[PDB]
Write a protein that binds this ligand. Sequence first.
Ligand SMILES: [Mg+2]
Ligand SMILES: [Mg+2]
Ligand SMILES: [Mg+2]
Ligand SMILES: [Mg+2]
Ligand SMILES: [Mg+2]
Ligand SMILES: [Mg+2]
Ligand SMILES: [Mg+2]
Ligand SMILES: [Mg+2]
Ligand SMILES: [Mg+2]
Ligand SMILES: [Mg+2]
Ligand SMILES: [Mg+2]
Ligand SMILES: [Mg+2]
Ligand SMILES: [Mg+2]
Ligand SMILES: [Mg+2]
Ligand SMILES: [Mg+2]
Ligand SMILES: [Mg+2]
Ligand SMILES: [Mg+2]
Ligand SMILES: [Mg+2]
Ligand SMILES: [Mg+2]
Ligand SMILES: [Mg+2]
Ligand SMILES: [Mg+2]
Ligand SMILES: [Mg+2]
Ligand SMILES: [Mg+2]
Ligand SMILES: [Mg+2]
Ligand SMILES: [Mg+2]
Ligand SMILES: [Mg+2]
Ligand SMILES: [Mg+2]
Ligand SMILES: [Mg+2]
Ligand SMILES: [Mg+2]
Ligand SMILES: [Mg+2]
Ligand SMILES: [Mg+2]
Ligand SMILES: [Mg+2]
Ligand SMILES: [Mg+2]
Ligand SMILES: [Mg+2]
Ligand SMILES: [Mg+2]
Ligand SMILES: [Mg+2]
Ligand SMILES: [Zn+2]
Lengths: 124, 208, 138, 150, 99
Amino acid sequence: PTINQLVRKGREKVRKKSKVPALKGAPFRRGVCTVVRTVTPKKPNSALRKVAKVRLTSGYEVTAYIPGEGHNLQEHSVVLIRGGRVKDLPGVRYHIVRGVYDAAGVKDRKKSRSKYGTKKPKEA
Amino acid sequence: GRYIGPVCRLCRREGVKLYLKGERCYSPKCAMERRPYPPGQHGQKRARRPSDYAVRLREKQKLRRIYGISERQFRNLFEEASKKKGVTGSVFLGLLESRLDNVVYRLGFAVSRRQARQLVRHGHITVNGRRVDLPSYRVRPGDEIAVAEKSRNLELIRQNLEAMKGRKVGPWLSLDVEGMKGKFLRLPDREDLALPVNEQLVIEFYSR
Amino acid sequence: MLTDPIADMLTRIRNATRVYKESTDVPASRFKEEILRILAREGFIKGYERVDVDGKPYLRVYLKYGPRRQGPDPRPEQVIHHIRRISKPGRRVYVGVKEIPRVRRGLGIAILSTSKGVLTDREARKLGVGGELICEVW
Amino acid sequence: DFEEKMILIRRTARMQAGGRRFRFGALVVVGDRQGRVGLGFGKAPEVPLAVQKAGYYARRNMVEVPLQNGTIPHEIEVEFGASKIVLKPAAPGTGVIAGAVPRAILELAGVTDILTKELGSRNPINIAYATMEALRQLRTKADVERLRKG
Amino acid sequence: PKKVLTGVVVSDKMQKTVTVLVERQFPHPLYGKVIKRSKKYLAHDPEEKYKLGDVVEIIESRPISKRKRFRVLRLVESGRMDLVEKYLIRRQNYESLSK
RNA sequence: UAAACUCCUGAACCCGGGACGAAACCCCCGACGAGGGGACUGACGGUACCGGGGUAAUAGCGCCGGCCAACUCCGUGCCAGCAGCCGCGGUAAUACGGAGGGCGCGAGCGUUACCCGGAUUCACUGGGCGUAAAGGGCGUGUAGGCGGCCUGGGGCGUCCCAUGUGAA
RNA sequence: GAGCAAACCGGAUUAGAUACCCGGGUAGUCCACGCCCUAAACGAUGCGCGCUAGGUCUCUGGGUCUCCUGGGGGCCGAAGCUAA
RNA sequence: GUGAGGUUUU
Ligand SMILES: [Mg+2]
Ligand SMILES: [Mg+2]
Ligand SMILES: [Mg+2]
Ligand SMILES: [Mg+2]
Ligand SMILES: [Mg+2]
Ligand SMILES: [Mg+2]
Ligand SMILES: [Mg+2]
Ligand SMILES: [Mg+2]
Ligand SMILES: [Mg+2]
Ligand SMILES: [Mg+2]
Ligand SMILES: [Mg+2]
Ligand SMILES: [Mg+2]
Ligand SMILES: [Mg+2]
Ligand SMILES: [Mg+2]
Ligand SMILES: [Mg+2]
Ligand SMILES: [Mg+2]
Ligand SMILES: [Mg+2]
Ligand SMILES: [Mg+2]
Ligand SMILES: [Mg+2]
Ligand SMILES: [Mg+2]
Ligand SMILES: [Mg+2]
Ligand SMILES: [Mg+2]
Ligand SMILES: [Mg+2]
Ligand SMILES: [Mg+2]
Ligand SMILES: [Mg+2]
Ligand SMILES: [Mg+2]
Ligand SMILES: [Mg+2]
Ligand SMILES: [Mg+2]
Ligand SMILES: [Mg+2]
Ligand SMILES: [Mg+2]
Ligand SMILES: [Mg+2]
Ligand SMILES: [Mg+2]
Ligand SMILES: [Mg+2]
Ligand SMILES: [Mg+2]
Ligand SMILES: [Mg+2]
Ligand SMILES: [Mg+2]
Ligand SMILES: [Zn+2]
């Protein structure tokens, strides 16, 4: 506005916050899943998608998504987390990197092969 | 390691005829004859207009594919090209034409860039005894360049001065065929260094 | 009050050029006197003189325009395109010898205030001075 | 002997009882690279009439762009409604840095080097009319010297 | 090059010293506005000649207290009690903002 | 031209040689200074490098509806899934998985977290307040921000010149 | 405390009146007091100054009252503004 | 100067 109001009041900072609540600025964080029950999606689409509530090492317990054609998970599983968001689920804002020692990648995967974490498909 | 594979593939998608093989390019077998369409089994599709990103992308290919210097090897060249004081779209062309691939090739010691890159790369073409196995050398103005004394009587160099038995190359260089050497005199300009590339729609893409 | 009579005079200029007045008035001052030989020097307005209306020291402003050319908006084009005062009381503006704006690349001009009177852009680059940037016609 | 490049195709609609209709409005920029440039906005229910009719709508108007050192002579700040297009000069060989629509107009008029930027809205029609309104304010030194004869 | 800065006397309620604030002008480093700020510089008065409501000159010296560094060198003018009101009315305007 | 094929250079590999980095400290002559001369020392390292002989000898990653570069078939039929947004998959899915092709980069390619720009989306350059968010319900009034004309002084703010300094 | 009228009691309506309609009727509406702090407290337009075509209906001070010189209350409208 | 027992969303 006026210059005297710019000296007295001053402009404000926009104060954006972290969209992911994972502490310490972590790209990845080790977690343990508890129950892998499913959640129905929003209005435009319907799919019995795979979602596991994973407690972290920082004292949190979050709602995570499993990507790929199935998974290999148990109740006492160590699940490394990635983050991001899932658009058509109400509570999910985390992804799971397949390739960690309790989450191996799905076989027959050679196009998004490094994204879904599998080794080279051996020729025969 | 800049690109290894099908190299006349880039001509059919590129459009205008490119000279990167030599004896196959100047002959009427450059695969531009009888096969104009871009490669792949789509090829002669409908006449869809390329987007304005795609036109300057293909202009990035007409500046990059012929010279062979890759993209991470290329952004820095545009960076000191913009750092030099003058018309950057004209200084950049001769600035890439100050390298031992196209200085040696415009001197005519090779039939294409894949002979200049390789025969300079093994370490034969020397800058006055200081042999250089490395075509990324910036050629100074007025630099005389000769081949190795063991390379003066090879089975390929004798076929690499054959067409240039006294060829009147333009004023950005000089040459001595009977001494088998040359002298890059000064940096080439925009138009008399005549290669099929456009100037205007390049800095627009590289500033974005 | 007349808190800014100088911006009021520039509002006489930019207000008179939009409504096409032949002559207009401004209350007289020795600094408003000091503005006008730049405009009459570069040909923005014709002249200025000390007049008197009802016992009040005033100043006439003689505008000029171009020829009446054909086309939409047939009223002729103005000499200035407009004027915006830089030296505000709410934000004082002081420039050095190198803090000289490029006033339309060399087409318009800015009026400055130096210790050696009122002086302009090109002779500020040649003379090497600096002061309070008054205004900028472009 | 112009170039006549169409750059925008808009499919409009109006509601008739039972079913809505269509009206196609294109946007044709015409030029010859020596300063002559024109703009056309057409109204036709089908595409080649939407490009041709806007072509003649680009042909019956013409405005000459003054070219000093191959580029525009001076910087301008022009407000057409909400769109605030701002053009500036450049050095020779700098580059035609523009948005989509001045990238679609100044390369038809023939500007060698432009550094421009718009503010406010992003409507290509208002950037187009803001551009054709913007380049009419371009004057050289000579037509200001012969204008200012005091 | 010890600085010689002009201040104004608003209070001499404590003996052998004076409460002197110094007004000064500086533009804002971002917005660029010449605004007048002040900061009190407690000075010693060994002669007891500078009364309440003076305009004095200030030279720095060796400190005798916590939060004392300066002393009074000279008076430029005096008697302008209106500026002493221009501080002290701000002293009796702080009580209207409390619980 | 991709492959095999005629020809060539032959990275790796082997053989032999071997470095600047090192002349000082230390003595001799000389007037214990000034000056000149002589002597020792390498982890790197038998390495970088030089002279030859000599084998054609690694390649993958992400994307392909629009933003943004690049499409055909098979199976899946709101399920399996993609997903930064718009949002797709209901028997022709150019949006899923696979085959092929193409695109970008290349010993690198995608993904994540953070920061800036994009964003004029805190606007000092560079925004508004009738209807999109916005004038306090209104007035007096403290501090503050300012402020009519002319003359004279101060040179505090402002401008100019040389120097200290803004280390590396 | 005359009338009206929250709450509430009955008649019709409807599955339903606790509403629109009707019959009374309670604080309240009215007066002095100390308080309370609210809105479509609107012109959804902060205050003050200066400039910028006019036409049209009235209030008000003066004249040379035919018309002009100050202020204030509405409509259209030049330039200008706005996304309209 | 004059008009509605009056309605619910598929
Ligand atoms: Mg659905
Ligand atoms: Mg091959
Ligand atoms: Mg916007
Ligand atoms: Mg080959
Ligand atoms: Mg052979
Ligand atoms: Mg051999
Ligand atoms: Mg020793
Ligand atoms: Mg001895
Ligand atoms: Mg010695
Ligand atoms: Mg010695
Ligand atoms: Mg050893
Ligand atoms: Mg050794
Ligand atoms: Mg071989
Ligand atoms: Mg596309
Ligand atoms: Mg996609
Ligand atoms: Mg920015
Ligand atoms: Mg910003
Ligand atoms: Mg602002
Ligand atoms: Mg806004
Ligand atoms: Mg509203
Ligand atoms: Mg509102
Ligand atoms: Mg006050
Ligand atoms: Mg004041
Ligand atoms: Mg003043
Ligand atoms: Mg004076
Ligand atoms: Mg000073
Ligand atoms: Mg430094
Ligand atoms: Mg009743
Ligand atoms: Mg009002
Ligand atoms: Mg009337
Ligand atoms: Mg009257
Ligand atoms: Mg009047
Ligand atoms: Mg009136
Ligand atoms: Mg109106
Ligand atoms: Mg208008
Ligand atoms: Mg109904
Ligand atoms: Zn070819």
